Design a protein around this ligand. Structure first.
Ligand SMILES: *[C@@H]1O[C@H](CO)[C@@H](O[C@@H]2O[C@H](CO)[C@@H](O[C@@H]3O[C@H](CO[C@H]4O[C@H](CO[C@H]5O[C@H](CO)[C@@H](O)[C@H](O)[C@@H]5O)[C@@H](O)[C@H](O[C@H]5O[C@H](CO)[C@@H](O)[C@H](O)[C@@H]5O)[C@@H]4O)[C@@H](O)[C@H](O[C@H]4O[C@H](CO)[C@@H](O)[C@H](O)[C@@H]4O[C@H]4O[C@H](CO)[C@@H](O)[C@H](O)[C@@H]4O[C@H]4O[C@H](CO)[C@@H](O)[C@H](O)[C@@H]4O)[C@@H]3O)[C@H](O)[C@H]2NC(C)=O)[C@H](O)[C@H]1NC(C)=O
Ligand SMILES: *[C@@H]1O[C@H](CO)[C@@H](O[C@@H]2O[C@H](CO)[C@@H](O[C@@H]3O[C@H](CO[C@H]4O[C@H](CO[C@H]5O[C@H](CO)[C@@H](O)[C@H](O)[C@@H]5O)[C@@H](O)[C@H](O[C@H]5O[C@H](CO)[C@@H](O)[C@H](O)[C@@H]5O)[C@@H]4O)[C@@H](O)[C@H](O[C@H]4O[C@H](CO)[C@@H](O)[C@H](O)[C@@H]4O[C@H]4O[C@H](CO)[C@@H](O)[C@H](O)[C@@H]4O[C@H]4O[C@H](CO)[C@@H](O)[C@H](O)[C@@H]4O)[C@@H]3O)[C@H](O)[C@H]2NC(C)=O)[C@H](O)[C@H]1NC(C)=O
Ligand SMILES: *[C@@H]1O[C@H](CO)[C@@H](O[C@@H]2O[C@H](CO)[C@@H](O[C@@H]3O[C@H](CO[C@H]4O[C@H](CO[C@H]5O[C@H](CO)[C@@H](O)[C@H](O)[C@@H]5O[C@H]5O[C@H](CO)[C@@H](O)[C@H](O)[C@@H]5O)[C@@H](O)[C@H](O[C@H]5O[C@H](CO)[C@@H](O)[C@H](O)[C@@H]5O)[C@@H]4O)[C@@H](O)[C@H](O[C@H]4O[C@H](CO)[C@@H](O)[C@H](O)[C@@H]4O[C@H]4O[C@H](CO)[C@@H](O)[C@H](O)[C@@H]4O)[C@@H]3O)[C@H](O)[C@H]2NC(C)=O)[C@H](O)[C@H]1NC(C)=O
Ligand SMILES: *[C@@H]1O[C@H](CO)[C@@H](O)[C@H](O)[C@H]1NC(C)=O
Ligand SMILES: *[C@@H]1O[C@H](CO)[C@@H](O)[C@H](O)[C@H]1NC(C)=O
Ligand SMILES: *[C@@H]1O[C@H](CO)[C@@H](O)[C@H](O)[C@H]1NC(C)=O
Ligand SMILES: *[C@@H]1O[C@H](CO)[C@@H](O)[C@H](O)[C@H]1NC(C)=O
Ligand SMILES: OC[C@H]1O[C@](O)(CO)[C@@H](O)[C@@H]1O
Ligand SMILES: OC[C@H]1O[C@](O)(CO)[C@@H](O)[C@@H]1O
Ligand SMILES: OCCc1ccc(O)c(O)c1
Ligand SMILES: OCCc1ccc(O)c(O)c1
Ligand SMILES: OCCc1ccc(O)c(O)c1
Ligand SMILES: OCCc1ccc(O)c(O)c1
Ligand SMILES: OCCc1ccc(O)c(O)c1
Ligand SMILES: OCCc1ccc(O)c(O)c1
Ligand SMILES: OCCc1ccc(O)c(O)c1
Ligand SMILES: OCCc1ccc(O)c(O)c1
Ligand SMILES: OCCc1ccc(O)c(O)c1
Ligand SMILES: OCCc1ccc(O)c(O)c1
Ligand SMILES: OCCc1ccc(O)c(O)c1
Ligand SMILES: OCCc1ccc(O)c(O)c1
Ligand SMILES: OCCc1ccc(O)c(O)c1
Ligand SMILES: OCCc1ccc(O)c(O)c1
Ligand SMILES: OCCc1ccc(O)c(O)c1
Ligand SMILES: OCCc1ccc(O)c(O)c1
Ligand SMILES: OCCc1ccc(O)c(O)c1
Ligand SMILES: OCCc1ccc(O)c(O)c1
Ligand SMILES: OCCc1ccc(O)c(O)c1
Ligand SMILES: OCCc1ccc(O)c(O)c1
Ligand SMILES: OCCc1ccc(O)c(O)c1
Ligand SMILES: OCCc1ccc(O)c(O)c1
Lengths: 624, 624
């Protein structure tokens, strides 16, 4: 196996385990030391102000199995430190009959058992498990563990009656799934249910949703309420919070609701961030975020979605969350978004970016799979003075509209997402920053124009504001990870409203995915403006390309160019003329970003292992 | 719930958990501190000379489940001390995917992993498990753990390829069972296989048997050999050692071979005890001991058997153990006999005595289930100068015969069992000993004659030699645990060759078993003698009645009299006349025995617990 990145790649399947560990590996984001990772879990801000982040983890393997919580902490979302205990960087693992098949996703009760931070997690045991299989009651249950050392270790409650698992009865029959308990406090829901507590006897200050669905009849988000304040064993099922139809779609801007929900959460936001009012703040909006399964032909059959909801109180003392408008949290190769409260009235969200090696051709050669997205502040995005002539505006698909008194302007409201400012500040401060001159893309524009300053490696950020004519048919954007022979093209086409990532030339290595990514972007036209603007930021981090548009649209994807010099970047232009011009300003390159794991060496592989012939006998895990 | 033992018992099912803990509980033998126990396991003499005894254990429950190794140690087989660690008296428990369903029986490699004592045990996982069910490969595997602290704790090898479990492939298809690995060294088998090691490549100094059977085709004992000396991962299957037919019986003296073996072991004995020769000792005999399932209408469908075997070497470098004669290790309510080597050329055996409460009516009220038998030295019993006119002698059912040169006398050989002398010495020395005058039971004998000295509680031993006429039709024996209203009768009837325990009056409490126990006893008549003798020893220990006859026949059973004064004992006589007399001599009562657990208080209950609704969902354990 040759690792010569100045010539064409050979047969890389002949390479040994973890021989490509550093080749495509992100350096500026959250990632496990080695092996398999997927969903974020157990996210909380600790009493000292630091952030605890857990993740679904299978060390020394490159496929899912024995799924455990790996963990680390950070003071700024950006530079991280691994926990290191008796099980290395793991802090919760399968150990009891009720969770031996996997410690699935869970969330944090900040003041729980004996006042300690407490995780409510899906404990899995034997039997078919999946939305397309005939799952039985007991296979997925919900269990508690608490930490007396700020997340270095967790103590599970004992197995048995009145102890773990604490939630095991299916609330409705024939479930497709029953997992990912999301614990939260809600002055809003407490106020709404206050006149119904005689019906249910549930009066606790914590709620929990469990994600699932019903066979043949669509996804479900089940709402529970803590029965009594200060007591954590008894959780009372109120009713279904979100009910969607079998492979129902709200439209082109909204993905598809599939057959089963995963990793669903509930929050309330206002224009500044997190909202803690009871309903009295008229600017605040209730949101649900959730993954869906089997409503998509690609992207591992997975949509990470969100919806703004209006709560209605049922006669039986439960809540119906009626979808008002519905969108997509990320349009690319990411899933399993978790959100959590942070000091200063913030709600922060983070997801999992999977690889684009679905046939598992080079996974062993990597010696790892997966990374996190960047951490994102959620808020209510408000756009004022929107022109009613904005095409398709009143369809209100993933946004709401409110007319002015005179009907001549509109206020648009939607879900906002932006990278946490701690990360942006650290990235910019540690990078070599080049502020680039603005460019008019007209008849003289080449198809590709390299920036006047270039990156030095695969770790950089780009930003730019693209100003388009209201009736433009021109396309523009950014090319990244670019040499003459390999490059990844990020295009926006205002006429179609499509943001695409074309990956036909992303790599000489043909086993990686090369399909075109697509996001819809609505450019809300402002009253009196003769142009419309796309603010586009791109993070390039090893193989991750993470794109943000107008603090609204996110698209995470993967590119794995072989050649050492496939690091360049610049501007893309198509159909720009003397008449149809695209103006580009606010251009900056941040070269280098941040070393997110300063204590880790470059190669943190510990080798890979095989579970042996019994993996196939048990039939639970691939075994490698 | 009244505990007044001076009046009739009330409805004892209304009594609370462990309220009858001390009422019927043995005090002079090995028993768990509380809860469920069954099979002995992990038996070895430690480097300091003490005995380590493990047992199948489920604390705080009175039915089987989460089965673990409880453990204790003793310098003399008699007075014991519990281990006490992080899991109380447990030292191995379900903790990994491969053993989460139960840590079943296992045995000791004395110099194993890194030179430490090492247990090879049956690690069980999910799926149907049992001789009458459709078990699949993987559900029962064999795994290693080693101890660096003389049995206070055990470290399992890691899960995976080249590690645990170390034996997982079924050696033949459609097994009824695949468990209870019995590790042993055998100069005999090494010598026999020495010319075949090129065929198999197995040259290690340890052998292991695994107990099981084949569906519809009888029980099997599978022989493995350690592949290489000093290496413990690789064990090579040679072939079936013992093969018996579906519910085959060798006869009235031999129980029934059932459908499946459990807890089988292999040893070699001579007249003094254990034999370590290669075949050169002409007085030594090869033995297999084994439990059988589903060959019996009662006694939990379980026979604890043994067989003398003659080894034949197969062409494929394996051993066939051909049954020469076949007997019963204990005729009563015991099973799961394990044997192990002890210093001074001894092989010591011990089993499990279950309760006689099969409908589980008072198990919660007890707060425990089960005890061990006494520890027994095994040896080759040789009887010289046997008369050829001994009825049925030449059928050689559970014994062999060898004629003298002149054909006028016979040497009889069979399996001998006797209580270890350490226990007998301790029992006698700590007891109030009454040596009783000999008695002629004739026309003047009452049906029951109390001994001139009486026991003071339910903890005592009796011994006596009963001399019968060669053509007697009289019966005699011992009555124990006796008041006017409750008593247990132990009879020998030489005309039928039946030793019985009649339990119709054993207790006023009707939920306990009251069926008659039966053992066959051959009185080998000596040349020139005008009488035949039964030497009978009885241990009474709470509810245990353990009977030994002629260092050959053992019968363990249970009696649970309610009344406080149902402790008496004496002689039984039936059909004794002036002409048909039974002489009784060597009569002794040992009142008190020994406190086998001096550090334990009288009540070591920790309460009982319920596993909750998930027990039924998982379907593995009863849950209580
Ligand atoms: C099959 O069998 C297995 C094995 O038996 C079963 O698994 C066992 O199940 C039992 C019973 O549930 C568990 O016992 C509990 O243990 C926890 C502590 O767990 C932690 O610590 C253990 C011991 O640590 C020590 O030894 C280790 C090893 O040498 C060493 O590393 C360590 O440094 C230390 O020296 C660890 O072994 C254990 O690890 C295991 O579990 C981890 C996950 O938790 C896992 O990651 C590991 O890999 C490993 O598997 C873990 O770290 C005890 O806290 C708990 O005792 C509390 O709860 C019971 C009630 O059920 C109560 O009786 C006790 O009194 C106690 O409750 C008091 O304290 C609480 C905490 O402070 C408090 O909240 C309570 O309110 C209560 O407080 C009382 O006192 C205060 C005054 O102080 C007063 O104010 C209050 O009013 C009140 O009176 C149990 O003992 C075992 O941990 C577990 N073991 C394993 C190995 O799995 C399995 O369940 C069985 N399966 C089936 C199907 O049956
Ligand atoms: C799902 O995930 C779970 C969790 O990750 C998996 O379970 C884990 O699996 C791993 C991997 O197999 C195990 O790691 C091994 O651990 C043993 C030690 O185990 C004991 O000690 C652990 C740590 O103890 C410390 O912390 C605890 C807790 O705070 C504390 O109580 C204690 O005081 C101490 O401070 C215990 O946690 C562990 O308890 C667990 O297991 C018990 C049963 O064993 C159970 O009863 C408990 O309830 C609990 O569950 C236990 O007590 C290590 O010895 C071992 O490391 C050796 O082996 C590997 C090879 O695989 C090798 O890389 C290492 O270098 C090392 O081998 C060297 O040392 C050996 C021993 O001396 C020697 O024999 C070797 O030859 C080798 O020697 C080398 O060095 C010498 C020089 O010294 C040289 O001469 C030689 O040539 C050579 O170079 C592993 O690290 C985990 O224990 C296990 N954890 C749990 C909680 O279960 C699970 O398998 C996964 N499931 C699936 C399906 O994937
Ligand atoms: C002393 O030691 C003890 C440890 O041993 C310790 O703990 C106690 O342990 C004992 C066991 O030894 C525990 O006793 C058991 O308790 C169980 C639970 O009882 C509660 O739940 C029952 C079942 O609930 C389902 O069904 C109901 C009726 O259909 C519904 O109303 C429910 O909604 C629920 O339905 C859900 O689940 C279904 C599947 O199960 C599903 O189909 C359905 O769709 C839905 O999802 C209730 O029936 C029960 O209610 C009765 O009892 C309470 C309390 O007494 C009363 O207040 C009520 O009015 C009502 O009468 C409880 O709410 C029991 O299920 C279990 O019963 C079994 O065993 C007993 C005795 O043998 C039988 O009478 C019974 O028939 C059951 O037998 C079972 O076995 C057979 C075969 O052997 C099996 O085929 C059959 O189906 C069944 O499985 C048993 O009584 C006890 O709970 C523990 N108590 C604790 C932990 O506190 C104890 O504490 C120690 N003491 C001290 C002082 O320390
Ligand atoms: C980059 O490397 C390739 C392969 O060695 C080479 O052909 C090319 O000249 C280099 N420079 C570029 C594309 O700017
Ligand atoms: C570089 O990054 C670190 C880690 O995130 C951060 O704390 C530091 O402030 C950054 N340096 C700057 C902004 O100069
Ligand atoms: C034993 O106790 C019972 C019940 O109290 C009583 O009837 C009897 O007289 C006592 N003594 C005996 C049987 O010797
Ligand atoms: C009493 O029993 C103990 C424990 O078995 C034993 O060590 C001791 O020798 C006995 N006492 C005698 C024989 O006097
Ligand atoms: O690893 C298991 C976890 O990952 C998810 O499937 C999301 O992709 C969760 O629903 C589950 O808790
Ligand atoms: O508890 C399980 C153990 O008990 C037995 O069934 C004997 O009765 C063994 O075969 C097994 O190892
Ligand atoms: O202890 C639960 C604290 C909490 C409050 C609000 C949330 O949205 C949440 O995820 C957790
Ligand atoms: O279970 C009572 C112990 C406890 C101590 C401190 C707390 O803040 C708490 O909520 C509970
Ligand atoms: O694999 C069949 C799973 C299944 C379970 C319940 C249903 O109602 C169904 O349609 C399918
Ligand atoms: O379904 C379990 C019933 C139960 C509830 C609370 C307890 O403390 C208990 O022991 C059993
Ligand atoms: O008194 C008004 C505060 C007010 C406005 C809206 C609400 O939903 C509420 O609970 C309180
Ligand atoms: O809603 C106030 C915050 C906000 C952030 C980014 C935007 O693009 C916007 O229009 C509003
Ligand atoms: O064909 C799109 C129809 C139409 C025009 C303008 C809008 O704001 C709208 O909602 C629909
Ligand atoms: O929505 C298309 C018609 C229209 C109505 C009101 C306006 O202010 C406008 O600019 C266009
Ligand atoms: O000024 C260049 C950006 C731009 C392009 C097209 C326009 O119609 C416009 O107003 C601005
Ligand atoms: O969503 C991209 C964020 C962004 C914000 C402001 C800008 O000027 C920009 O170029 C990008
Ligand atoms: O869309 C405006 C982009 C732009 C601004 C100022 C300039 O000088 C330019 O060349 C382009
Ligand atoms: O380390 C195994 C020692 C051993 C020798 C002979 C036996 O019969 C035995 O059970 C163990
Ligand atoms: O694995 C080599 C370690 C070892 C040390 C001492 C021994 O007696 C032994 O058999 C092995
Ligand atoms: O429950 C059916 C178990 C079974 C397995 C294999 C067989 O050959 C058989 O006869 C029965
Ligand atoms: O069947 C497992 C093959 C294998 C044998 C020995 C090993 O050390 C190993 O890693 C795999
Ligand atoms: O040389 C005789 C020793 C001898 C007799 C019988 C045997 O089986 C043996 O191995 C050696
Ligand atoms: O085989 C010598 C030992 C032995 C012990 C007890 C007996 O009853 C016997 O006949 C021989
Ligand atoms: O009916 C029993 C037949 C018989 C008599 C004496 C014996 O030793 C024998 O083996 C068979
Ligand atoms: O076996 C019954 C006939 C018999 C043969 C030889 C004897 O020495 C004897 O006592 C009886
Ligand atoms: O001496 C009383 C015992 C005994 C009973 C019957 C006999 O035939 C005998 O020889 C001895
Ligand atoms: O098998 C009962 C043991 C025993 C041996 C010698 C005796 O004198 C006796 O009465 C009992
Ligand atoms: O079987 C002989 C029993 C016995 C021996 C001596 C006696 O004095 C007696 O009365 C009974």
């Amino acid at each position: 196996c040759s690792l010569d990145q100045t010539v064409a790649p050979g047969n890389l399947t002949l390479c040994g385990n973890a021989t490509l560990f550093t080749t495509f590996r992100p350096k500026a984001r959250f990632i496990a030391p080695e092996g398999w990772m997927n969903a974020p879990m157990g996210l909380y801000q600790r009493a000292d102000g630091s952030i605890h982040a857990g993740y679904q983890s299978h060390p020394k393997h490159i496929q899912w199995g024995n799924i455990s919580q790996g963990a680390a902490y950070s003071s700024d979302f950006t530079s991280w430190t691994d926990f290191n205990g008796s099980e290395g960087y793991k802090t919760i693992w399968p150990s009891q009959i009720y969770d031996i098949r996997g410690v699935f996703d869970g969330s944090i009760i900040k003041e729980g058992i004996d006042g300690y931070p407490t995780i409510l997690y899906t404990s899995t045991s034997f039997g078919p498990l999946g939305a397309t299989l005939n799952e039985a009651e007991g296979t997925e249950t919900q269990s508690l563990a608490y930490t007396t050392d700020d997340g270095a270790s967790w103590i599970k409650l004992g197995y048995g009656a009145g102890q773990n698992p604490v939630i095991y009865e299916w609330p409705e029959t024939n479930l497709t799934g029953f997992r990912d308990p999301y614990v939260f406090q809600s002055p809003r829901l407490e106020a709404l249910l206050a006149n119904t507590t005689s019906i249910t006897n549930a009066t606790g200050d914590h709620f929990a949703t469990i994600s699932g669905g019903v066979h043949g009849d669509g996804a479900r988000l089940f709402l529970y309420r803590q029965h009594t304040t200060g007591e954590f064993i008894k959780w009372t099922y109120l009713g279904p919070l979100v009910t969607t139809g079998y492979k129902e779609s709200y439209g082109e801007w909204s993905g598809n609701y599939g057959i089963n929900f995963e990793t669903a959460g509930v929050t309330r936001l206002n224009p500044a961030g997190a909202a803690w009012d009871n309903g009295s703040d008229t600017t605040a909006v209730d949101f649900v975020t959730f993954g869906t399964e089997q409503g998509r032909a690609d992207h591992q059959n997975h949509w990470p979605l969100w919806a703004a909801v209006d709560y209605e109180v049922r006669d039986n003392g439960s809540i119906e969350a009626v979808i008002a408008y519905s969108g997509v949290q990320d349009w690319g190769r990411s899933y399993a978004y978790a959100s959590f409260p942070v000091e200063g009235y913030r709600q922060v969200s983070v997801g999992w970016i999977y690889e684009d090696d679905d046939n598992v051709i080079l996974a062993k050669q990597f010696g790892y799979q997966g990374a996190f997205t960047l951490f994102r502040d959620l808020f209510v995005k408000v756009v004022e003075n929107v022109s009613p002539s904005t095409p398709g505006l009143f369809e209100q698909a993933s946004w709401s509209t409110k007319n002015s008194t005179d009907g001549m302007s509109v206020t648009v409201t939607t879900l906002g997402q932006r990278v946490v400012p701690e990360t942006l500040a650290a990235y910019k401060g540690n990078s070599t920053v080049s502020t680039l001159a603005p460019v008019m893309l007209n008849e003289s524009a080449a198809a590709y124009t390299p920036f006047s300053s270039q990156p030095t490696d695969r770790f950089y950020a780009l930003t730019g504001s693209f100003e388009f004519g209201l009736n433009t048919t021109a396309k523009a954007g950014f090319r990244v990870l670019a040499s003459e022979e390999e490059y990844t093209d990020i295009w926006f086409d205002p006429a179609s409203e499509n943001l695409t990532v074309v990956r036909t030339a992303s790599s000489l290595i043909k086993s990686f995915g090369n399909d075109t990514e697509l996001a819809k972007v609505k450019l809300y036209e402002i009253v009196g403006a003769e142009s419309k603007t796309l603010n586009l930021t791109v993070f390039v981090d090893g193989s991750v390309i993470e794109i943000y548009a107008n603090d609204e649209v996110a698209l995470s994807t993967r590119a794995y160019p072989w050649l050492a010099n496939s690091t360049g970047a610049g501007l893309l232009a198509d159909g720009t003329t003397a008449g149809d011009v695209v103006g580009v300003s606010g251009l900056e390159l941040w070269d280098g970003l941040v070393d997110a794991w300063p204590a880790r060496p470059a190669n943190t592989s510990q080798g890979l292992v095989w579970d042996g012939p019994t993996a196939a006998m048990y039939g639970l895990f691939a075994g490698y």
